[PDB]
Design a protein around this ligand. Structure first.
Ligand SMILES: Nc1ccc([C@@H]2N[C@H](CO)[C@@H](O)[C@H]2O)cc1N
Ligand SMILES: Nc1ccc([C@@H]2N[C@H](CO)[C@@H](O)[C@H]2O)cc1N
Ligand SMILES: Nc1ccc([C@@H]2N[C@H](CO)[C@@H](O)[C@H]2O)cc1N
Ligand SMILES: Nc1ccc([C@@H]2N[C@H](CO)[C@@H](O)[C@H]2O)cc1N
Ligand SMILES: [Ca+2]
Ligand SMILES: [Ca+2]
Ligand SMILES: [Ca+2]
Ligand SMILES: [Ca+2]
Lengths: 295, 304, 305, 293
């Protein structure tokens, strides 16, 4: 009855916190966690997935490392003391673990990818016969408005624009947590104190990860990646629009931009659910309430 | 007569038309010439519309010339429907827009302000073909672009989209640029009450302006944008020259995308200073709407 | 014997390349996988199976690959190669099944279990090869080199600037050329010199076995703005180069594939006069001893006696 | 005589093109304007003035043009040349070109042997004068390999946007690219022939041509092919084809894409020179050099 999900990510503090949120939610059955490279080198992102799973006592979840660089371009949890990995990744690549999971699943699986789209694009292009086994792809990346890496582009998308465009043109429903929503999903100093007052080793780690992070004029720090998991858990916390998104791969000034046809100016059929607002307090409540799982 | 000397390049177009009305009712401004760009209409039509507006406004003394027939490297894509306008009673000068612009610069004793409220085609031509006159251009004030969402394609505003290369030439020119994009112009809405205020002013020109606002809103009320009233784009350029204190603006780097698969014509504004790039533009981002409406109605009294 | 992986989109010349490879005991064909380009992926796969049926090598593992280019829609070399993709001669129906997996999977499996580096020969669009490279960076060390048919230093045969295989999937080809693995390129520069004249096709037909018959009837089908004396035979130059590199003249140069141009998508940009900074990444074939090439083919056709 | 406008960036070969044009009474050179590419715009202007001083044609009006490409960033060593004895006109190249067209009674031929910057400016800013332009004869581009980047010839690469403007203009274009110019080589023996003609001008021309991976037998003479094609088109083989200039590629900015095998829908927009009778080209030059006897 739980929703089967594949998590692909590049921890990264917010990826890490998204893993914590997912494993505290019995509505979700995390089938595997695979690592992309962007926030760090692929050796480090893999290591970080293994450390998080060690911390959270879920060494039963299969892990594989993915692509070592973006498709056509060149190419992490400081703060708290984290455990050394006590287990090994699977002897195969992220795409292979993803494909394997799809093949053997009896119902469609949800992909949540919160690093660059590199591994997800590879799976899509290399396994067209498994597209039917993918319910939807939930991403953290992009920005309808101003980017955070270049003027037009958010980092995840900018690191591998081609991979992202492959995802959005794939024919599989996409849900997009871009900067428009994640910038609203701020954790204020008081919130971080709330998480820390919960009083278990994990809520402590989450609070310290957050401590570390601390021209945009944010009141507190945005928490990007957990917005993907939070939307699956409580979509009613979010406002979203169904629109066409294209990713720029050629521009002189705009490589990696997510072009969102908000006012229907193109002929293009919508391919994405674009998150545009969140109930910030509700988002904090969800995170604070699920942290009680590690009591 | 120490008014600010200005060159107006435009593609009327109801809002260009209203910009002309505002400028000629402002003795702070000395309009040296009006030239026509093509965008809102064919170049025959935009030229004609400049001539009709000057005929209406009893300023047949301002020299007019037609400009480029198409964007620098792309194909082109009455223009003042609604009110009855007069037929032209005077002829454009026997030259091109670029030639009239250059002439004006050469013979001006002080730098001239360019206001271009159509595509940037003529301005870019003047810039590239007269580098020895850059010193005679104080600044270029444009209506075009959007820091946020575009009104023509998802990423692009119309004027820039029609001639991205010309706009990039303007912004890379080294001459200070002032940009009235959709971020401010979409705030500069004329509500139905405002159009009634203009109409109550009671002279042939305020009547024309109100009827121009009439036609627009009746036939082009944007149902997806959720505007309370119709945005008045072009007059924001003139208003900023008249009362900059009505506006909020930031000094940022702006690039125009000329190569993107999805983004041709986008004005990329480096709002959060993420690039290395030296600011080249003053980007208007807010306006005091009521004050903007007040300016228009105060200046419409000129035609009493 | 040199272990090779063959990735191809038959297509008459791919087919004749298969024939040549299987008549050469210098080469150990480890698998044949199918790309889409010349035809739909259903048809290319079928035609690999038909050729292996014909040549009684049903022991070679076959798998179908990617159904479309990485980031573009499929276009096919439709009426050039006709209906089935191998029109002309009667061919046998497949008597065996492809492996239960994708081309990239069979490729990876082959590399993993090989004891020495494997040579990839790819004679359709580079789609499967690029997928293997990006998804298996830990197996690059098991790839000796990639030998392609594609590209043109001069004029293209599909658009003014581009050759078909490259044009169908420029992004795949650029991935191959940027990969760090040695590339050998049989482009139109050489393949347009590797013409089979009517006399040569008559020679193949005179060899008198079922297979040389099929190869001759295949060429028959492939027969005026180019002003060729007879028909260029593109794909078998990859295998010929592995068999007898002394037939060929080649230069080591930098090659880039254009993925963004308005007029030039799919161009192979070859830095023939060293004008760029760029480190050579390819061996580009630029000439062939045509008669020697024809001799090679005919000599190896005797294998099917 | 055929009225022509010469826009160029001397440059030794532009210089030799000027020499040939002024020795040809079939041609009426209406004006010479300077582009920037081979050198800075100050230098190219100066060189036009030096050449016309040398050749005793200070009566031909000269103007300096654009100081850089339309959208991008931006010369006669060897022989002793005279200092300029006259001044350029007090206007820009585009102005002098427009003025020339306006006051011509019949269409004018434009020969542009530098980047196409001034010609593109003329075309875009004077659409009412297109009818006064018979054709634009250019030295630039390559159907085959480039001499500047792998895909691109210099003149075109310097201002790809100006070149694409010219080719998309609707005015007939004639293209002397590397395909023909690399065949138009001057061998050591030819340079000695020129030198033996025995006047100050043939001497200057020789001292220029006097001064590796391409494997040329002698030096290609690029710009004079434009003037030669006007004088003796029968020396050349050419094809009527569609030509587009790449202005966006990652690796191919400045490439002239010639649709030699009719693979696009596109209407031909250009006469593309593909061969030359080299000896006949050399004979034309030697023959015309006698003008300065
Ligand atoms: C700053 C903060 C966080 C990130 C990472 N990139 C996405 C948001 O842009 C998230 O997935 C973060 O892991 C990147 C940057 N540059
Ligand atoms: C819609 C609304 C207004 C215009 C015209 N272009 C600018 C705003 O985009 C203004 O200068 C209007 O003249 C054009 C369109 N297409
Ligand atoms: C036309 C279109 C496509 C082909 C195919 N593509 C390459 C040569 O361009 C070869 O690998 C042929 O299979 C061949 C021809 N003649
Ligand atoms: C090398 C580089 C540049 C030139 C100049 N560029 C054009 C052809 O390439 C000619 O007009 C030469 O003047 C000539 C040789
Ligand atoms: Ca992340
Ligand atoms: Ca306008
Ligand atoms: Ca093939
Ligand atoms: Ca030159």
């Amino acid at each position: 009855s739980a929703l089967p999900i594949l998590l692909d990510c590049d921890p990264g503090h917010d990826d890490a916190i998204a893993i914590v949120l997912a494993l505290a939610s019995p509505e979700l059955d995390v089938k595997a966690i695979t690592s992309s490279a962007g926030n760090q080198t692929p050796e480090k992102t893999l290591r970080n997935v293994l450390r998080m799973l060690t911390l959270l006592n879920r060494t039963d979840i299969p892990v594989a490392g993915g692509a070592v660089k973006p498709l056509m371009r060149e190419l992490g949890l400081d703060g708290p003391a984290l455990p050394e990995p006590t287990f090994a990744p699977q002897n195969c690549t992220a795409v292979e673990l993803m494909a394997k999971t799809l093949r053997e699943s009896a119902e469609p699986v949800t992909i949540v990818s919160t690093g660059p789209q590199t591994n997800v694009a590879l799976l899509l292009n290399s396994h067209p016969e498994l597209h039917s086994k993918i319910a939807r792809i939930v991403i953290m990346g992009g920005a309808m408005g101003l980017g955070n890496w270049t003027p037009a582009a958010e980092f995840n998308i900018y690191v591998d624009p081609e991979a992202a465009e492959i995802v959005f043109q794939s024919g599989i429903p996409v849900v997009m947590a871009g900067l428009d929503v994640t910038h609203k999903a701020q954790i204020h100093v008081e919130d971080t104190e709330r998480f820390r007052a919960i009083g278990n080793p994990v809520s402590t780690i989450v609070a310290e990860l957050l401590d570390f992070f601390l021209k945009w004029g944010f009141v507190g720090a945005p928490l990007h990646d957990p917005c993907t998991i939070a939307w699956l858990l409580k979509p009613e916390l979010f406002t979203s629009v169904e629109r066409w998104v294209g990713v720029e791969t050629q521009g002189k000034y705009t490589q990696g931009m997510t072009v969102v046809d908000y006012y229907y100016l193109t002929g293009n059929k919508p391919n994405a659910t674009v998150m545009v607002d969140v109930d910030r307090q509700g988002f904090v409540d969800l995170l604070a309430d699920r942290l009680k799982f590690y009591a």
